Design an enzyme around this catalytic site. Structure first.
Site, PDB file in Angstrom:
ATOM      1  N   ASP A   1      23.769  -8.780  19.622  1.00 56.70           N
ATOM      2  CA  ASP A   1      22.500  -8.882  19.416  1.00 56.70           C
ATOM      3  C   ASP A   1      21.964 -10.043  20.155  1.00 56.70           C
ATOM      4  O   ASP A   1      22.257 -11.225  19.664  1.00 56.70           O
ATOM      5  CB  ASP A   1      22.296  -8.876  17.886  1.00 56.70           C
ATOM      6  CG  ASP A   1      20.732  -8.909  17.479  1.00 56.70           C
ATOM      7  OD1 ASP A   1      20.028  -9.638  18.350  1.00 56.70           O
ATOM      8  OD2 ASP A   1      20.409  -8.516  16.411  1.00 56.70           O
TER       9      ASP A   1
ATOM     10  N   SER B   1      21.139 -13.663  18.073  1.00 56.71           N
ATOM     11  CA  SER B   1      22.240 -14.079  17.124  1.00 56.71           C
ATOM     12  C   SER B   1      22.841 -15.574  17.309  1.00 56.71           C
ATOM     13  O   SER B   1      22.594 -15.987  18.413  1.00 56.71           O
ATOM     14  CB  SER B   1      23.278 -13.031  17.160  1.00 56.71           C
ATOM     15  OG  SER B   1      22.900 -11.654  16.513  1.00 56.71           O
TER      16      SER B   1
END
Ligand SMILES: Nc1ncnc2c1ncn2[C@@H]1O[C@H](COP(=O)(O)OP(=O)(O)O)[C@@H](O)[C@H]1O
Ligand SMILES: [Mg+2]
Lengths: 209, 50, 241, 221, 233, 316, 258
Positions: free
Chosen positions: D166, D169
């Site tokens: 992601d 992150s």
């Protein structure tokens, strides 16, 4: 704490006279009657050669310098002013003495408290441990007591009692002993009187503390 | 009045110790005993005013 | 020193709040009386009940209310002020459960009403309501809880409390009783309370002219004991004594 | 921004990543996304950093006042209720998704408070950017009533999945183990991404760009 | 005397004295004994917790409460007023914590509680808070002990006592107090100054003592206070 | 300094069992030098000399005092003696307090005073002078005791240690009463009490003031009730402190109860909760003398006086 | 009786409660102030230094309203704190709006309008406070004012408010150089007036507080003199008076010789 009693004791070992008055007796009603009585009292003091004049509660009349805006505070101040005149004035006393007990000793007039020709100061505090032991001894020697009735464990206990309180403890203990019908008091009697006239200062509202 | 009282109290202190003499320290103690300036201990009432 | 008496916000020269004291005098003016005692695993409240007319309904006349499921209260004081205070306590309990998401400890409920009364004694509005409110409940950690919420701002916790006309004698008797093995059973606590009230009153209780409520660590609900329970306790326990 | 949380045998184990992107630029490397609402309640914030931080602080203040009033440790139902009610009173503009967790007298608790003020008590909760991968890992490798070390490994692997699948992150995986006995705040527990190991020194020696003016001020000691 | 100008609080006197606040301070002095000592490395607060019976569960209402894990507060005067001031003091401390991320300095907390008292002593229908507060704190590295009075006045103390016999308490502290009095001895001094004011036996349960040092303000538990009392006796 | 503390504890065990080894170990600890920055070693060695003085007290081994007052002074100017002078106070007190005569007697105290004079440490010079005054009173050289006391109090009215002011004033009062000038002894006592009602009076000083007050009232005013009151306050204080001289206070208590012509209370006091640990020939002697006074039997009275010599023959 | 309400006019046109506050200020501490061509200074009498109190606040009676102004307070402590906070707020409000440290006159006028509102509105007793403001402003340099409870303010070269302030100002009148006094001479005169006005004939750092404002390097500096400087000044003055006494004794000896 014992000042009326020392006054009465000097009266006992006195040779001239002990003329006792209460400040209310000057605070009597009718203008000028208080000054009249103070002047009569001091005149009696003088006409007696070495006499002594005692005033038991002076906070009633002996006050500060409040500008009396009424007809009554003015009369109270008049009583105090007459007292000042008589104690010291154009007619200096001849061998006459004066004693006062006040119980506050803070709002007395600077005049009457004049650390000169009007008054000396003495302290009469709460009976300390020493004084309290002497209180017990003097009150209790006259009574009849057991062998397990040691008073020395009714003094070491912290407690803000006074001489009047201790006299009351002893008198109440004896009363209770007679009520329970013994002719010798005991530690239970003293315990009960102790708790009867130590915690009596209670039933107050608790939100104040 | 304070001056008279100071002399008188020095004299009474002398009377205490079977002595007919007043000394400087006796006068000092007389001053202390006569000029007793009682002061309120309520620090709050005393600090009300800055 | 009687000139400092006509307002709830003017001190006396000796630092006394006379119209706070007069609220307590109103408590005494309530006429009735109440007592409460907490045991090892139970809490019991006993209270007068006067029904001086055959038409008064005992179903309505009652001074043991249910503030919430677990917390109950006994009132001692003017009935109207008592019921206003009861409504306030119900409101605050509900709001607590709504906001913080768990039943209000008796600690906090008594604190909260005490603070309402304090607000009234300081800001010169309302007229400090004349009732004394004694709360009983079950607290998971400490255990049973008995608290008193006087109309001046104390929310103090009690091993055994008394309110009303016979407060002094009740407190004396409760001290005498507590000084002996405070670990009391359910029936022994119910007794201690009822016996205290009976002795301070110099009366023997009918099974009806007394209201008794109880909570327990096994029954954490404000159970208002019925005529049957009152009669059973009185007769059987006085007999077996 | 990825956070995760699991409930284990004795308490709760929370785990967040350390990154907060202002765009596609990694503004921070070591942000503090686990916040302290009370000695036994910690909250993992995702979404808009400012609002999560201020909301957590206000709720912590209210709960600390509540604790000092009660004497007993605050219980997580109150934290959840305050958070949710505030976030609902504000109709959703507070972009703070909060994985709240704690251990109180009634065992552990792990709520998930979505921005609008919707709460869902649950054993494991992930919400944020990488909640996708975090919950994938949880579903695939969760077993009820884990112990401390296994719960920590689970909530760390979930966040690692978030890190690695992601954008936005973190770089460090911070954890928080809360129980009736311990309050460990691992900050940071793991460093999945360390640094690029800068190459040959290339500084500019003392003296590379002269000046136009100076007002060197002699401030006292 | 100045009689008429004593039923209000928005009317000076010829002396310039606002009688009502002085009356409030009289109410304060007519309260429980409480003592405060600023040790060299801490502060100690104590206060008589005597009840009117064994009935009162003497663990339900405390008198030495915290406002943060570096500041605490004890009182002499009334109790409801005290609860209000403690609530507002906690609220002010937390407001300061939010605005500035730093535990409230004790001086500023004292200043703001004093401002609250001022708010309450300045209108025609607000009774001045009758209670005087001792605020203990540890800021930077120097322990702080302040006193806040109903008059809105806040002032530092090396060591003081307040309640029924504040004169006796303060003379005793004057005798027994030296600057370099480490905390373990400051506790004994505070307990002794409470003894010289505490009727009846100073049991471990009818005395409340709170100590504020670097570790943070903490109210001593019954076991610790009993240990200290036995040691002193 | 855990190892040093273990060495000190084994030295204590040797004090318990084989004292000479403890003496040697403490002497070695003292001989050990100390750093110029830290102070743990100097703390350890000052405790070592304290326990060495304890050994000297236990075994009457005063032969080391020459060293303990000659060779320890140099280093001692390292721990800010302004506050550590209590150590020298304790050393000198215990020295002069062993059972056996010190031989040097005032000589060593004068040597200490001269050392303090050289050091220019007036704070400890005052303590040394006061202890010397007490020594003079104990040896009964009342005249020089009084002279030093007057000098020292003239100095202490303008300096610190008001507790030592009270000590010196009471020493002067005791010397005055010993010389039998009761009015001047009373003046000294009143000054001491006025100065004591402005500072903290430890239990020891408060009870000493009470006992001296009792002695003066007993001698002069003939107010034996107040004399007994003060004597009992002194007795309670000494009992609380666990002090050697509580038997003397109790003896004076019984003496007051006798001279008040109320001898029936002597037995009550002697068989009294507090006054059991002090039971012994001391109290039994007052018991017998009060029995004689009760029975008005001069034969028994003199019998008791001769039979209880050193219990009622010596305390003046 | 025309003194039961602030907003009540008396039949002889006097705001009694205002006069009540004005006289009440006398019971407060003692502040005096002196303007000198080089600087300005205030002196303050610490009424209460009971040895169990503390000295946490470097100044218990003098406050720093902003970089260019200070104010000494005398009166009720609560009103003092309220007024000092409002003064700081006014100063920084002026800075925000205009971006120039407020002229001392404008700041004083603002606070005194606040006090006027209080003495003219509803149920609010007049602020029982009197303040001495010192400062520097680009318009009229160094400046010193006194503001009373009634909201009236006067610009004084030297002045004094508090206990025996009448005596202090009389001695200021006697010994003030109307256009030539420097800062050191101002300090000397302040010490002399403090010594003659404070109840105790002996001064020390435990009863006085001196504040000095001076322009240096183009920026203002408000310094509260430390106890070292305070004691040095007290000394210098006491020994100067002792030298004067020795000269008087020498004059007496000369007269005896004559
Ligand atoms: N030292 C004492 N010895 C014996 N009784 C005392 C003593 N002090 C007080 N009392 C008791 O107090 C009472 C007298 O108190 P009093 O002197 O009238 O106090 P006050 O006049 O201040 O009210 C007496 O009945 C007496 O028994
Ligand atoms: Mg009488």
């Amino acid at each position: 704490c014992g000042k009326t009693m020392l006054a009465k004791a000097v009266a006992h070992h006195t040779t001239a006279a002990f003329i006792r008055v209460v400040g209310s007796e000057f605070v009597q009603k009718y203008l000028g009657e208080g000054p009249r009585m103070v002047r009569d009292v001091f005149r009696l003091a003088k006409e007696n050669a070495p006499a002594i004049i005692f005033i038991d509660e002076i906070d009633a009349i002996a006050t500060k310098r409040f500008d009396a805006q009424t007809g009554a505070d003015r009369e109270v101040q008049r009583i105090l002013l007459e007292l000042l005149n008589q104690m010291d004035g154009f007619d200096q006393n001849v061998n006459v003495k004066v004693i006062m007990a006040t119980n506050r000793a803070d709002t007395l007039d600077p005049a009457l408290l004049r650390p000169g020709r009007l008054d000396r100061k003495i302290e009469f505090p709460l009976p300390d441990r020493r004084q309290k032991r002497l209180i017990f001894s003097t009150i209790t020697s006259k009574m009849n007591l057991s062998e397990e009735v040691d008073l020395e464990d009714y003094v070491a206990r912290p407690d803000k009692i006074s001489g009047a309180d201790i006299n009351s403890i002893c008198q109440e203990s004896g009363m209770l002993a007679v009520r329970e019908n013994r002719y010798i008091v005991l530690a239970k009697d003293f315990e009960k009187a102790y708790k009867t006239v130590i915690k009596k200062d209670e039933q107050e509202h608790e939100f104040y503390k | 009045a304070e001056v008279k009282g100071v002399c008188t109290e020095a004299g009474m202190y002398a009377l205490r110790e079977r002595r007919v003499h007043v000394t400087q320290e006796d006068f000092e103690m007389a001053v202390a005993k006569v000029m007793q300036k009682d002061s309120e201990k309520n620090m709050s009432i005393k600090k009300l005013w800055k | 020193s009687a000139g400092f008496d006509r307002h709830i916000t003017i001190f006396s020269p000796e630092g006394r709040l006379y119209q706070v004291e007069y609220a307590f005098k109103a408590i005494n003016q309530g006429g009735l009386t109440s007592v409460a005692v907490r045991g090892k695993d139970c809490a019991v409240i006993v209270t007068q009940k006067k029904v001086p007319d055959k038409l008064l309904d005992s179903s309505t006349v009652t001074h043991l209310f249910k503030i919430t499921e677990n917390i109950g209260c006994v009132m001692t004081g003017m009935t109207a002020d008592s019921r206003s205070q009861v409504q306030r306590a119900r409101y605050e309990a509900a709001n607590w459960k709504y906001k913080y998401g768990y039943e209000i400890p008796v600690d906090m409920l008594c604190k909260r009403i005490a603070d309402i009364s304090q607000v009234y004694t300081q800001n010169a509005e309302m007229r400090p309501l004349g009732c004394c409110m004694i709360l009983i409940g079950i607290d998971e950690e400490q255990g049973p809880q008995v608290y008193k919420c006087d109309p001046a701002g104390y929310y103090c916790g009690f091993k055994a409390t008394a309110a009303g006309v016979k407060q002094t004698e009740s407190t004396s008797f409760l001290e005498k009783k507590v000084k002996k093995k405070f670990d009391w059973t359910f029936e022994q606590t119910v007794e201690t309370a009822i016996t205290c009230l009976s002795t301070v009153l110099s009366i023997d209780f009918k099974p009806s002219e007394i209201e008794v409520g109880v909570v327990t660590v096994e029954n954490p609900k404000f159970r208002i004991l019925t005529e049957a329970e009152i009669d059973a306790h009185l007769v059987a326990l006085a007999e077996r004594d | 921004t990825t956070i995760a949380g699991v409930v284990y045998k004795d308490g709760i184990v929370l785990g967040a990543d350390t990154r907060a992107t202002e765009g596609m630029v990694v503004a921070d490397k070591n942000c503090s996304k686990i916040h302290f609402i009370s000695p036994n309640i910690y909250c993992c914030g995702a979404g808009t950093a400012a609002d999560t931080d201020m909301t957590t602080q206000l709720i912590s203040s209210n709960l600390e006042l509540h604790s000092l009033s009660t004497g007993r440790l605050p219980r997580v139902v109150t934290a959840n209720r305050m958070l949710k009610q505030m976030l609902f009173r504000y109709q959703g503009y507070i972009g703070a998704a909060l994985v709240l967790g704690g251990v109180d007298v009634t065992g552990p608790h792990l709520y998930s408070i979505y921005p609008h003020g919707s709460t869902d008590k649950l054993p494991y909760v992930t919400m944020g950017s990488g909640s996708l991968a975090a919950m994938a890992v949880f579903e695939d490798k969760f077993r009820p009533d884990m112990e401390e070390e296994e719960a920590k490994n689970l909530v760390s692997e979930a966040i690692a999945a978030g890190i690695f699948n992601d954008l936005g992150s973190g770089s460090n995986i911070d954890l928080c183990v809360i129980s009736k006995n311990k309050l460990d705040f691992l900050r940071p527990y793991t460093v999945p991404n360390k640094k690029g190991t800068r190459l040959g020194r290339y500084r500019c020696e003392k003296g590379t760009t002269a000046v136009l003016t100076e007002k060197i001020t002699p401030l006292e000691i | 005397a100045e009689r008429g100008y004593s039923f209000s609080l928005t009317t000076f006197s010829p002396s310039g004295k606002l009688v009502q606040i002085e009356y409030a301070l009289a109410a304060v002095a007519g309260g429980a004994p409480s003592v405060g000592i600023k040790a060299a490395n801490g502060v100690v607060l104590a206060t008589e917790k005597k009840q009117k019976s064994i009935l009162y569960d003497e663990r339900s209402v405390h008198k030495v409460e915290p406002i943060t894990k570096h500041i605490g507060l004890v009182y002499s005067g009334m109790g409801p007023d005290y609860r209000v001031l403690v609530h507002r003091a906690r609220k002010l401390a937390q407001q300061y914590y939010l605005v500035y991320q730093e535990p409230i300095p004790t001086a500023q907390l004292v200043q703001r509680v004093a401002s609250v008292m001022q708010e309450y002593t300045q209108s025609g229908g607000v009774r001045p808070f009758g209670v005087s507060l001792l605020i203990c704190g540890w800021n930077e590295g120097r322990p702080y002990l302040f006193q806040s009075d109903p008059s809105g006045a806040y002032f530092a103390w090396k060591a003081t006592a307040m309640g029924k016999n504040y004169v006796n308490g303060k003379t005793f502290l004057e005798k027994r107090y030296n600057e370099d009095l480490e905390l373990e001895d400051a506790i004994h001094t505070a307990i002794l100054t409470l003894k010289e004011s505490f009727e009846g036996q100073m049991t471990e349960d009818n005395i409340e003592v709170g100590i504020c040092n670097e570790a943070g303000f903490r109210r001593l538990t019954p076991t610790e206070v009993k240990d200290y009392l036995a040691a002193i006796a | 300094a855990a190892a040093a503390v273990v060495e000190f504890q084994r030295a204590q065990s040797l004090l318990s069992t084989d004292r000479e080894a403890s003496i040697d170990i403490l002497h070695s600890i003292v001989k050990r030098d100390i750093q110029e920055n830290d102070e743990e070693a100097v703390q350890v060695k000052e405790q070592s000399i304290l326990e060495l003085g304890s050994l000297l007290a236990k075994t009457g081994q005063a032969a080391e005092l020459g060293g303990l007052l000659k060779y320890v002074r140099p280093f001692l100017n390292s721990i800010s003696k302004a506050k550590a002078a209590r150590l020298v106070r304790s050393l000198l007190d215990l020295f002069l307090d062993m059972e056996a005569a010190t031989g040097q007697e005032v000589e060593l105290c004068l040597e200490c005073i001269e050392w303090a004079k050289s050091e220019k440490r007036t704070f400890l010079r005052q303590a040394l002078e006061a202890r010397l005054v007490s020594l003079y009173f104990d040896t009964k050289r009342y005249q020089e005791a009084l002279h030093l006391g007057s000098q020292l109090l003239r100095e202490l009215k303008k300096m610190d240690d008001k507790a030592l002011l009270v000590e010196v004033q009471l020493l002067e009062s005791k010397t005055y009463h010993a010389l039998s000038n009761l009015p001047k002894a009373r003046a000294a006592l009143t000054s001491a009490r006025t100065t004591a009602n402005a500072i903290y009076c430890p239990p020891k000083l408060q009870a000493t003031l009470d006992m001296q007050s009792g002695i003066i009232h007993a001698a002069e005013e003939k107010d034996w009730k107040t004399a007994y009151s003060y004597f009992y306050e002194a007795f309670e204080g000494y009992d609380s402190i666990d002090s050697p001289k509580a038997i003397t206070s109790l003896k004076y208590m019984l003496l007051c109860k006798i001279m008040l012509n109320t001898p029936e209370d002597v037995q009550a006091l002697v068989s009294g909760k507090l006054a059991l640990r002090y039971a012994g020939r001391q109290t039994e002697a007052l018991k017998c003398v009060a029995q004689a006074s009760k029975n008005r039997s001069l034969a028994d009275f003199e019998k008791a006086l001769t039979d209880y010599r050193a219990e009622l023959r010596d305390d003046p | 009786r025309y003194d039961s309400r602030t907003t009540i006019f008396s039949p002889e046109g006097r705001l009694y409660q205002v006069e009540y506050a004005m006289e009440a200020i006398g019971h407060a501490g003692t502040c005096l102030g002196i303007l000198a061509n080089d600087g300005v200074l205030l002196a303050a009498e610490r009424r209460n230094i009971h040895k169990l109190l503390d000295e946490v606040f470097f100044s218990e009676k003098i406050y720093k309203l902003n970089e260019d102004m200070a104010c000494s307070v005398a009166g009720i402590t609560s009103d003092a704190n309220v007024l000092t906070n409002e003064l700081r707020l006014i100063a920084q409000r002026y800075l925000l709006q205009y971006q120039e440290p407020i002229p001392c006159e404008q700041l004083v006028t603002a606070l005194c309008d606040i006090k006027q509102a209080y003495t003219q509105f509803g149920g609010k007793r007049p602020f029982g406070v009197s303040l001495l403001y010192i400062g520097w402003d680009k318009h009229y340099g160094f400046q010193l004012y006194q503001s009373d409870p009634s909201g009236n303010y006067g610009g004084w070269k030297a002045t004094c408010i508090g206990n025996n302030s009448a005596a202090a100002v009389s001695m200021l009148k006697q010994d003030y150089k109307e256009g030539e006094m420097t800062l050191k001479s101002a300090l000397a005169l302040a010490i002399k007036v403090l010594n003659k006005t404070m109840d105790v004939s002996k001064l020390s750092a435990e009863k006085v507080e001196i504040a000095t404002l001076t322009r240096e390097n183009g920026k203002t500096v408000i310094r509260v003199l430390k106890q070292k400087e305070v004691e040095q000044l007290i000394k210098k003055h006491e020994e100067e008076e002792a030298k004067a006494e020795r000269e008087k004794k020498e004059k007496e000896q000369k007269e005896k010789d004559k």
